[PDB]
Symmetry: C2
């Protein structure tokens, strides 16, 4: 028997393999802000991946840096190759993009880099979350006010724009609802398999398309002027949103974390009533009667501890309890990241007029060397659309000549003319496009922008 | 934007990558003929994989050669990594085999070689199966004696052994029923998704006792067979794995989604005749004790042409009709291979006493130089050669010792000094040593009839 060479992929061979998967033309930069009914095109900005270090796994203080957002976009596209998508208007015309996403090359390229991507995205959870008995697990299970999402949407200068930015975050999740959960009911195991499929049955709405939860979220999006084609608002997905959705494909694809999904299954269903009640009350508060919230209220109309957790512990032993606990705590940490990330973006979107005015005083500090900041000069023609991204330090955009559309979120835009600019806060999703025949502008890497005031 | 380097894996780098995935100790040779309640260990015989050419894809005339059987075993192991398995007696004790099967290394190594394995396994179908209209398709759909399976089991010298060999072939399929089809209901598309999930619902029952996999459990336990995967892995036929791997092939690769739409029509619309013949066959062989509720419950075909095929062609155009037909015809070719492979295996098992007698005359023909390469072997007690096959007939001649020659589930021969057996090509077979030592020769006679 020949010796086994352990699987290894790191260093430059990892960067080349990640670039290889992402250089597929369906992943290149979009010329518009939205995807036009094409579920096979996902913008991964491949021109930046060669310059990132995937060997250096970041901590929680740095999971909002661009490399983590770049990895989230790669992981979403890698996971979703197992899911069936077709445009709302049909496959006719998009056959070539359909073949470039579902091909023997695309999945193998993404599956070979998945272990390394799955460690840059979730490696920090080891520092954020012993032996257990069924008795200790019970008490921990028994020990489980305005939400941060309510404060940001209700306290926003534009409540409707804030809520619409919140709804599109659930597009990859709710429109393919229970797709990650179904990864566990494949195979052959005990009665817990039928019990888990019982959740999927309700999650798919008995087979009827009208009561399917994915169709319910369509009417929710269509009631506020938003579309339901994936992935229309891909460029408006926050880092934390992809992190939350990718976590269940992470738990669902890798069956060694099957008991971690069992823990997160309890926590979601036991917190789902309060979440759906808050979403229904908040949406009707922002939009009124015109909003369709049947998706959330149906969940209140609708078994895991006795019918799944208990028989699994009796059959597979007490050694699986820490993983059930770890799945609960890992998910709670991720929810905290979403509340912080989403609240920072809304405040960043609402403060756009003042951060544009703030460009002046920051610009004077640099001219007086209050800080020493690297500068880059750029000349781009109209239609050079920088896809949405973020930076690890604050930047000062200064427009010398021309006209630029600075994007900070769905419905949040600034027109920047000659002599004007904007202060770009770090870790915030943002992009830009040129609206004039030519635009000359500068980018100042000031680190902390408050050091220039 | 850096230029795109197209995915490439062939030649020596392909063999190294296949050996790399299969050298996981959970894939090593089993010391017994059966797996004892461990769904994470599958025998892939990795010490033979370096000596196969995966670049030369064989045609249908050679898809029963051993190289195809080796690829079938790997593809099943790669496909089933997406499936949840737990032992019947619990995990407690299989933790490291459980971690050795469900790990990022096992999945990435198997997914990297999957495109090449799928070209070796299904490449012949390109030579075995234009534009279409909805009307041309309807007419093709409207135009679709004992079965070969009945003739083989009822014509067998041991009908009970014949039927038990037939039941274990469906273990990876029936015990994980609707698992390949459920790969298509993940995602986000039109009403056709809800129609497909309704078919999956019937296969799962939602209740565990009425779940169709549980019905097949009581079927196997009623004839003395166990329901833990993969106990009879060494007794799985090439064509059996080929049929099961075909639906994971269609389910994993969503570019073949409409090929599955064709295969969905044919199976459910032919499953009634299949289940009725199986119910009649099992009751004739076993009698009152056999539980055939699995087959009678199945007795989807009409919901699939109107509620799935019709709106899909209306939504995606006529260009998907050729793939729907291809899924139908590709499935019919594989059933033809299963019927031939299974009929040949039973005839090979029933003819064991005569093939032992036939060793004598084949052996003198070699003694007259009428035909053969020879290999001498000295193996100790407990040397269990896992089941495999060869591309030509071989003559096993025993000089000294005792050997248990395995030819199938319940088919065995004791081979002593001076005796032997004629090993027919492409037939699943194995061997074990029953004496403190066994010295024997293996003669590669090609066609054994040239020695008579
Ligand atoms: Fe739901
Ligand atoms: Fe930027
Ligand atoms: Fe069924
Ligand atoms: Fe042999």
């Amino acid at each position: 028997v020949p010796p086994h060479v352990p699987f290894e992929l790191s260093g430059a061979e990892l960067r080349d393999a990640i670039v290889q998967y992402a250089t597929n033309p369906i992943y290149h930069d979009n010329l518009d802000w939205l995807n036009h009914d094409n579920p096979y095109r996902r913008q991964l900005r491949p021109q930046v991946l060669p310059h990132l270090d995937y060997d250096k796994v970041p901590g929680r203080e740095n999971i909002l840096n661009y490399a983590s957002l770049a990895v989230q976009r790669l992981l979403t596209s890698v996971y979703e190759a197992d899911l069936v998508f077709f445009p709302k208007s049909g496959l006719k015309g998009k056959e070539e993009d359909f073949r470039a996403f579902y091909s023997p090359a695309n999945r193998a390229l993404g599956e070979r880099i998945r272990p390394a991507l799955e460690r840059y995205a979730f490696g920090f959870l080891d520092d954020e979350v012993g032996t257990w008995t069924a008795q200790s697990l019970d008490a921990y299970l028994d020990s489980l006010e305005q939400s941060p999402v309510e404060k940001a949407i209700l306290g926003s200068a534009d409540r409707e724009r804030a809520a619409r930015m919140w709804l599109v975050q659930f597009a990859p999740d709710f429109l393919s609802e229970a797709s990650p959960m179904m990864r566990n009911v494949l195979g052959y195991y005990g009665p817990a398999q039928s019990e888990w499929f019982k959740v999927v049955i309700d999650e798919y709405g008995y087979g009827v398309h009208d009561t399917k939860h994915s169709t319910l979220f369509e009417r929710t999006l269509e009631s506020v002027g938003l579309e339901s084609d994936l992935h229309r608002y891909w460029q408006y997905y926050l880092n934390s949103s992809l992190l939350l959705n990718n976590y269940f494909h992470y738990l669902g694809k890798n069956h060694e974390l099957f008991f971690r999904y069992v823990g997160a299954l309890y926590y979601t269903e036991s917190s789902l009533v309060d979440f759906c009640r808050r979403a229904d009350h908040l949406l009707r508060e922002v939009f009124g009667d015109t909003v369709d919230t049947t998706y959330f209220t149906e969940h209140i109309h609708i078994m895991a501890r006795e019918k799944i957790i208990k028989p699994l512990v009796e059959a597979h032993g007490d050694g699986i309890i820490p993983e059930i606990v770890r799945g609960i705590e890992e998910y709670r940490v991720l929810l905290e990241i979403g509340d912080f990330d989403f609240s920072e973006q809304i405040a960043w979107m609402d403060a756009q007029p003042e951060l544009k005015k703030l460009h002046d005083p920051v610009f004077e500090g640099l001219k007086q060397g209050k800080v020493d900041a690297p500068v880059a000069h750029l000349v781009e023609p109209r239609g050079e659309l920088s896809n949405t991204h973020c930076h690890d330090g604050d930047e000062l955009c200064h427009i010398v000549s021309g006209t630029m559309r600075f994007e900070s979120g769905l419905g949040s835009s600034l027109t920047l003319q000659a002599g004007e600019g904007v202060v770009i806060k770090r870790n915030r999703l943002h992009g830009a496009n040129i609206e004039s025949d030519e635009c000359v502008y500068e980018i100042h890497s000031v680190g902390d922008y408050r050091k220039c005031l």
